Amino acid sequence: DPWQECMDYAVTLARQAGEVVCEAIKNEMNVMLKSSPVDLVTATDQKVEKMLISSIKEKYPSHSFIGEESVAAGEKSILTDNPTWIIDPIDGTTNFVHRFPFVAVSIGFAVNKKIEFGVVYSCVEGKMYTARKGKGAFCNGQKLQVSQQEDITKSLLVTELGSSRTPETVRMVLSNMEKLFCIPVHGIRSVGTAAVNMCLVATGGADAYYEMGIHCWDVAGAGIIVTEAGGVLMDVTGGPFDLMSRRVIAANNRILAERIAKEIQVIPLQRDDE
Amino acid sequence: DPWQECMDYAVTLARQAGEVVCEAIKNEMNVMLKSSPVDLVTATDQKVEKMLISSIKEKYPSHSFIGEESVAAGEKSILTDNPTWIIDPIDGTTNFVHRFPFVAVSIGFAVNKKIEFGVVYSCVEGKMYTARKGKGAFCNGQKLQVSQQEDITKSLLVTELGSSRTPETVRMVLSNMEKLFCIPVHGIRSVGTAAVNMCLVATGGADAYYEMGIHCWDVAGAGIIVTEAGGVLMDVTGGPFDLMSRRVIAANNRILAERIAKEIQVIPLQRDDE
Ligand SMILES: [Mg+2]
Ligand SMILES: [Mg+2]
Ligand SMILES: [Mg+2]
Ligand SMILES: [Mg+2]
Ligand SMILES: [Mg+2]
Ligand SMILES: [Mg+2]
């Protein structure tokens, strides 16, 4: 289809971006600050994003873009019906600065505000995760399938603590963690990137992911990888998944997703579309 | 080197154990319970430990053992001066049951109650971490070096929440995580195994690991990997590291280790030698 040519190009670009990231991770880096001393950015995040947007814009000039570093530079993160490339040039910048081995390039592609395809390249691992609506999810050609776990007490969750250090926000994040932890669940894991956490759910290695504070670019690529692997996306309220809401539950099934939603208390957050 | 032959044999056995683990991870399994509803054990944990102890006895019949599942079977958790093999047949049994991709076979070898060599095989990843006292630390033949970071606010920490679900214990674990998180630190990660968390600090991918509730077998293999990579081991009190204490800080340096010790509160625990 015409979107298959877009998807094939997106895989090529994700690989080229991953090579740049892989090369940069070995060298010294000037770590820069965004919103706080814990919200990081490097020249690599910015360079990768400029290369991806200029590459896609040259090939598809009528297409729209939503990129993390472009939004930090003053661009509007508004989602229209027009074909839109939703990019996180480096998802896991903190991991990248530390050489913690989970660093992803994420590309989500939306038509009529609905994701048609996703590409998440975990470059340190050399794992290319891809999915196209109705075509299934893959990691390096291996077809992915979510786990069958329907018992919350035998489940393994993934989450991240977030970029906020506000004492009130931190208490809510840890209280939500305590509640799920004491259901009990088998455990909670954190690899340091929303996109990779979600791909782990798509593989069946974890049963569900949840987070508040993420943005459309963190989840646009991985969301469709989870659903094409047989999983589900939901808001933390239990309502329909909304890409611009800052909230997500990405699980193997509705039973676990709904059970997680019941424990979570919502953190007030500025939507991506406001 | 009189212990180089024992170490060469330990690498062979850890790899042979890892092949057993890799093969078993693909299939459905009966999951048994230990100290809590989330403290798991399988026929694979038990089989691997038996295979390791019997292979060690064949070559070194005078040697002693401390094994996780052997201790669970009622074997004496005792550390004598005799050459001792300290084994965690599967470190990350929860990950193993879930196919979460961090599962380690860990062997620490002690003489006069001090670690002489350590082997940690992260089987899913295919990463063999090894170290001999005074000979350096390696991952698949590549020399390891801890990071240089001396500023806690620019550090990435690794830890685990533990097998306990006793509300007071859970409260203390999360409270310690909050205090560190708000210093601030760049972040906190959890791959689900003490041995692999420690090996990530030896690589320089994380700056420090801390945990209370672990056992000698969780840390005996990886502790020497951290130190041979240029790091340090300390008790959570700031005092010298003690293998049987259930407490550990494994850091790139004493500056970060001391700052973590100053910030957290001790959880009361039954020592492995009491
Ligand atoms: Mg990013
Ligand atoms: Mg991101
Ligand atoms: Mg960022
Ligand atoms: Mg074990
Ligand atoms: Mg263990
Ligand atoms: Mg165990």
UniProtKB/Swiss-Prot annotation, chains A, B:
Cited PROSITE patterns = IMP_1 (PS00629), IMP_2 (PS00630)
Q: Where does substrate bind?
A: 68, 90-93, 192-194, 211, 218
Q: Where in the cell is it found?
A: Cytoplasm
A cellular component annotation (GO) from this entry = cytoplasm
| UniProt name for this protein | Inositol monophosphatase 1
Q: What does this protein do?
A: Phosphatase involved in the dephosphorylation of myo-inositol monophosphates to generate myo-inositol. Is also able to dephosphorylate scyllo-inositol-phosphate, myo-inositol 1,4-diphosphate, scyllo-inositol-1,3-diphosphate and scyllo-inositol-1,4-diphosphate. Also dephosphorylates in vitro other sugar-phosphates including D-galactose-1-phosphate, glucose-1-phosphate, glucose-6-phosphate, fructose-1-phosphate, beta-glycerophosphate and 2'-AMP.
Q: Which organism is it from?
A: Homo sapiens (Human)
EC annotation from Swiss-Prot or TrEMBL = 3.1.3.25, 3.1.3.94
On the tree of life, the source organism's domain of life is Eukaryota
Q: Can you tell me which residues bind Mg(2+) 2?
A: 88, 91, 218
